[PDB]
Ligand binder design. Structure first.
Ligand SMILES: OC[C@H]1O[C@@H]2O[C@H]3[C@H](O)[C@@H](O)[C@@H](O[C@H]4[C@H](O)[C@@H](O)[C@@H](O[C@H]5[C@H](O)[C@@H](O)[C@@H](O[C@H]6[C@H](O)[C@@H](O)[C@@H](O[C@H]7[C@H](O)[C@@H](O)[C@@H](O[C@H]1[C@H](O)[C@H]2O)O[C@@H]7CO)O[C@@H]6CO)O[C@@H]5CO)O[C@@H]4CO)O[C@@H]3CO
Ligand SMILES: [Ca+2]
Ligand SMILES: [Ca+2]
Ligand SMILES: [Ca+2]
Ligand SMILES: [Ca+2]
Ligand SMILES: [Ca+2]
Length: 1055
């Protein structure tokens, strides 16, 4: 346009340095951006430095501590600003400086100038900017150049940007093929669109609430968005004379959704077998070109096809022959990536990949419906356990397992199947037989730690060494071991497992050598929890016997079939849609962010950096096409892999709407699929309504409850040191069997009991009980570290547990917390008493694999990368993996002292204790399914039938007495055999007597009577008058036998 003012840099050269520091000197330039615009011949007399030596930075020579002293004025100055020559006592380390005008700080940040980072000790700064630049040119380019990314192109016509506020010139510059930069004439002569102030519309403010306060700008309706989005876009603002005020990069996810999502959601993606051949489709609305590259089995390029761009959706597609089934392929992208500001060229695997080559290097065309990829009978495989009604869901009893934890140690599993999906088919193995036994006794679901394609195990077996293989192999694959204090074992002739056993003998908090060797092992072994997504909709390859191609698909299904058909359990998958393993245009495992840069990752609103609050590269399920990827992914696991439910990792990083949307999609496929998740720390409520415990009330989406968990275990996940011992739980004798360090009061102990009773009744917001003080409280009125304790509408919305893959095992918590006088048999009963609160409760029951075997990780808190050694589960029942070396020092080193003090209080569990615990455990699961009363499903029904005795300020501490009504006041008789049930958990060292049921015909459950001396209720006495005497550390289930019709039962009181 003729009459538009040209935007340009200031009409002054890029500055050089004023002075360079000499020996025992540092130099600070203050680049006077304001006066570089000239006009006024400036005056730096009042500029001064505040300089002081502390213990972090002490290289100043004669610093002036007096803050009111303003006599450290500039050594000199030129048209670019003043500078200071600062004497030093050395040339190493750093100095502390505050840059002032009088006593006013020009930079609101204690500046740290480190000589390691700036070797010439000559740096530059600008007012209002905490960054330290190595040159005035650098600082100058920062103030008059592209920086940050706080502009947000959020729909077709709306750009949100702070930098544009009340500026005369606001424009969106764009360059197809290069970086927007000032030309040789200092001008920005790239094409642009003009922006005029406007008002944040109502649709945008709902979509982006965290941006609703941004100053809004309008683009004219004529704009050709497709052309701008194919390259770099930079928001630019300038004064009336045209001099640049600021320039920043533009986040485009919002406008991409506004432009393309409606059309793009109507399409299907990936390599899709059709009637006529194969249709390939990938979503890449900013890519300049996409080529489909076809590879031979040997990974030679055998064809390369420019794809067809759909202008309405921004998807690219290509249609080829059906002989491409089984072919390997990648997408060759030409695409601008804002992180590098380069038009990148790279090949990327398919985000909708359903088959992979070894280590996920190539995607592969697959038809998951092929009978060649199914075990025989697959299509008729049925759910062994119903999930239809709320009473169906409440029977869910989950065993959370890991592929290697199941079989890596089991010598009765054929060696080639250890650590593999197919180990579940070894019908005669100890592990499978043990699982069958647990299933027969009432474990109903296996929950699998990540079995989608994880990034953090190398699927090339030549690159991996495991502890069961020779130490020499570990040295071959891990070059760090040569330089390690274990180098002498390379020639030892023994395995790594043998060496680790040998290091046990003199392992201590002073010589943590077991952990030392294991940390090296962990870098190149086959072990990881796998919360590190590479491809969301392909099985992990390292768990297959053959990771090359489609083989893993059939082995995975053969496992799923064996679990459902031979073991009798439903299957839940852990899924991790809240982050990707990596982002950016360079990293091997960046898939999504290479194809559509800055759309699938959640970004910082100012810098454009990929956030890392999840751990890693946070994803954006609030963006429509990632929501679709998630839903499409779950559809494949649901239909093609026959998964019965899904557990979302860090689910509160997801919008409630997206989770509910996803759930409605899957329910249309299979109505009985169960969704649940875990979340505690989402700071994302400013961007959308998060999918949290509170916000999910009533929705039927389940959440892990940390309430009963913390109350029974004691303490919380962030405890360390002595707090691990002091913070006893209900299961470890809080307020009834104190250890030597604790100060738990009786009131504190009773508060834990309130949380536990509340959890056993399903942790409902509206459930009514008598609290620690004898006061009537709603579940939501019980405090939980500030939050409302009860939060659910129905007990199916709550998953109770006392042990999980993350944080310490239950046994290691009891070992930390148990009094010295609690002997080994008592600690085994503490374990069972702890699990009884879960198994006999109204919430869905969840437990870590191996709790029935007193599982220990040698006090490891976070064992995601601690290998076969610390995660071992011995299905030969020799020991519980306790006391096998100090845990990893990087995460548990500040616990070494309390560990050494508590560790050897009693003997390590052996075969006798393991069998007893398993009996206890199967007793509990059998009781859970012995009556519909345990699993009412419905919150209103729980509220009508479940009550508690032994409550209030004078309760007998540690005695939990729950009643479940099946008499006339409750409604119908849900159980033909009983008019009521009493659950009594005596988590205490004293025997206790109940008179609450005196004269009432109460009797002990037949299951526990049949267990005899082996029962958790061994020694329970029911007297003639109906008084019940409970042994120490006991669990008793009692019942009122039903007569010819529904009796009076155990009516809830109207409190
Ligand atoms: O002085 C010991 C001090 O050492 C270190 O502080 C550094 C600090 O990192 C630098 O920023 C700078 O401090 C400057 C301030 O930057 C400057 O603004 C001004 O501070 C004023 C404050 O804004 C104002 O609130 C008030 O300060 C009070 C304060 O409210 C009181 O609580 C008390 O301060 C004490 C601190 O609480 C205490 O932590 C310690 O401070 C350390 C600090 O840990 C460390 O980072 O001691 C002080 C008291 O000795 O009293 C002050 C008022 O006396 O008023 C001041 C205006 O004077 O000035 C300070 C420096 O004077 O440099 C210091 C090192 O000198
Ligand atoms: Ca320099
Ligand atoms: Ca993998
Ligand atoms: Ca590892
Ligand atoms: Ca944030
Ligand atoms: Ca009944």
């Amino acid at each position: 346009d003729p009459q538009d003012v040209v935007v340009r840099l200031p009409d002054v050269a890029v500055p050089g340095e004023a002075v360079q520091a000499s020996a025992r000197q540092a130099v600070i330039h203050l680049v006077d951006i304001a006066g570089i615009t000239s006009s006024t011949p400036a005056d730096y007399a009042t500029k001064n430095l505040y300089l002081w030596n502390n213990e972090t930075c002490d290289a100043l020579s004669a610093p002036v501590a007096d803050w009111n002293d303003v006599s450290t004025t500039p050594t000199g100055s030129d048209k670019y600003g003043p500078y200071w020559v600062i004497p030093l006592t050395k040339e190493s380390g750093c100095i502390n400086v505050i840059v002032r005008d009088g006593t006013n700080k020009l930079i609101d940040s204690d500046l740290r100038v480190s000589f390691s980072d700036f070797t010439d000790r000559t740096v530059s700064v600008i007012a209002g900017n905490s960054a330290v630049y190595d040159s005035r040119a650098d600082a100058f380019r920062a103030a008059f150049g592209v920086a940050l990314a706080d502009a947000h192109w959020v729909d077709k016509t709306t750009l949100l940007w702070p930098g544009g506020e009340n500026k005369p010139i606001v424009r969106l510059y764009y360059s197809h093929s290069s970086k927007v930069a000032a030309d040789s004439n200092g001008e920005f002569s790239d094409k642009y669109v003009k922006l005029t102030p406007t008002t944040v519309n109502q649709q945008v403010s709902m979509r982006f609430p965290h941006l609703a306060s941004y100053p809004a700008f309008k683009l004219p309706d004529d704009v050709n968005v497709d052309e701008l989005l194919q390259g770099e876009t930079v928001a630019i603002a300038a004064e009336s004379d045209g001099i640049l005020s600021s320039a920043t990069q533009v986040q485009t996810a919002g406008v991409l959704d506004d432009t393309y999502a409606a059309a793009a959601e109507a399409l299907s993606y990936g390599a899709q077998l059709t009637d006529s051949g194969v249709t390939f489709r990938v979503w890449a609305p900013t890519a300049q070109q996409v080529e489909l590259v076809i590879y031979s089995a040997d990974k030679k390029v055998i064809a390369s096809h420019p794809m067809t761009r759909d202008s309405a959706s921004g998807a690219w597609s290509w249609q080829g022959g059906s002989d491409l089934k089984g072919a390997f392929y990648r997408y060759a992208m030409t695409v601008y990536h804002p992180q590098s500001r380069k038009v990148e060229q790279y090949e990327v695997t398919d985000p909708y990949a359903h088959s992979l080559s070894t280590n996920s290097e190539y995607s592969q065309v697959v038809d998951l419906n092929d009978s060649a990829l199914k075990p025989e009978g697959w299509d008729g495989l049925t759910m062994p356990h119903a999930q239809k009604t709320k009473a169906d869901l409440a029977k869910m009893t989950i065993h959370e397992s890991h592929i290697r934890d199941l079989s890596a140690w089991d010598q009765t599993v054929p060696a080639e199947l250890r650590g593999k999906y197919l180990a579940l088919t070894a019908q005669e193995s100890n592990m499978v037989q043990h699982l069958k036994q647990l299933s027969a006794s009432g474990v109903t679901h296996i929950e699998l730690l990540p079995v989608f394609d994880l990034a953090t195990v190398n699927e090339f077996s030549d690159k991996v060494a495991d502890i069961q293989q020779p130490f020499s192999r570990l040295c071959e694959v891990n070059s760090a071991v040569k330089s390690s204090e274990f180098a002498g074992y390379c020639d030892s002739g023994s395995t790594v497992e043998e060496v680790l056993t040998q290091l046990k003998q003199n392992d201590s908090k002073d010589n943590p050598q077991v952990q030392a060797l294991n940390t090296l092992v962990a870098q190149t072994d086959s072990y990881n929890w796998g919360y590190d997504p590479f491809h969301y909709t392909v099985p992990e390859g390292s768990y297959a016997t053959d990771p090359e191609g489609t083989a893993r698909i059939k082995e995975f299904r053969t496992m799923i079939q064996a679990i459902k058909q031979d073991l009798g359990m439903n299957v839940i998958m852990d899924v991790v849609y809240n982050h990707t393993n990596a982002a950016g245009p360079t990293d091997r495992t960046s898939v999504l962010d290479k194809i559509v840069p800055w759309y699938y990752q959640r970004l910082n609103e100012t810098t454009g950096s990929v956030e890392s609050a999840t751990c890693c590269s946070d994803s954006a399920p609030e963006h429509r096409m990632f929501a679709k990827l998630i839903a499409d992914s779950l559809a494949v696991w649901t239909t093609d892999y026959k998964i019965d439910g899904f557990r979302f990792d860090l689910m509160l990083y997801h919008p409630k709407a997206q989770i509910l949307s996803a759930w409605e999609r899957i329910k249309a496929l299979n109505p009985d699929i169960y969704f649940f998740g875990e979340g505690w720390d989402s700071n994302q409520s400013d961007r959308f309504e998060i999918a949290s415990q509170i916000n999910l009330k009533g929705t039927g989406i389940g959440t892990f409850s940390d309430r009963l968990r913390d109350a029974v275990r004691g303490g919380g996940p962030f405890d360390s040191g002595d707090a691990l011992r002091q913070n006893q739980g209900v299961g470890s004798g809080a307020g009834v069997l104190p250890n030597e360090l604790t100060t738990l009061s009786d009131d504190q102990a009773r508060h834990l009991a309130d949380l536990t009773r509340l959890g056993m009744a399903g942790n409902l917001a509206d459930f009514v009980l008598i609290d620690k003080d004898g006061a009537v409280k709603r579940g939501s009125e019980i405090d939980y570290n500030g939050a409302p304790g009860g939060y659910a509408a129905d007990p199916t919305e709550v998953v109770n547990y006392v042990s999980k893959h993350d944080n310490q095992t239950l046994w290691d918590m009891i070992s930390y917390k148990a009094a010295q006088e609690a002997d080994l048999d008592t600690r085994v009963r503490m374990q069972a008493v702890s699990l009884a609160t879960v198994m006999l409760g109204q919430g869905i029951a969840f437990d870590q694999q191996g709790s029935e075997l007193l599982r220990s990780k040698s006090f490891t808190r976070d064992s995601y990368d601690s290998g076969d050694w610390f995660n071992r589960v011995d299905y030969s029942l020799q020991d519980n993996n306790y006391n096998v070396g100090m845990p990893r020092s990087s995460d548990d080193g500040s616990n070494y002292d309390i560990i050494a003090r508590v560790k050897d209080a009693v003997a390590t569990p052996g075969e006798t204790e393991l069998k007893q615990m398993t009996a206890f455990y199967q007793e509990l699961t059998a009781l859970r399914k012995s009556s519909p009363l345990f699993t009412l499903g419905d919150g209103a029904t729980v509220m009508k039938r479940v009550d508690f005795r032994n409550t209030g300020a004078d309760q007998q501490t540690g005695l939990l007495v729950m009643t479940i009504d099946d008499g006339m006041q409750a409604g119908a008789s849900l159980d033909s055999r009983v008019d009521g049930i009493v659950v009594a958990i005596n988590a205490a060292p004293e025997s206790r007597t109940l008179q609450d049921f005196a004269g009432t015909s109460l009797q002990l459950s037949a299951i526990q009577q049949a267990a005899g001396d082996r029962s958790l209720a061994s020694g329970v006495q029911v007297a003639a008058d109906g008084s019940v005497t409970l042994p120490a550390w006991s669990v008793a289930v009692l019942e009122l036998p039903q007569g010819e019709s529904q009796g009076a039962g155990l009516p809830v009181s109207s409190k």
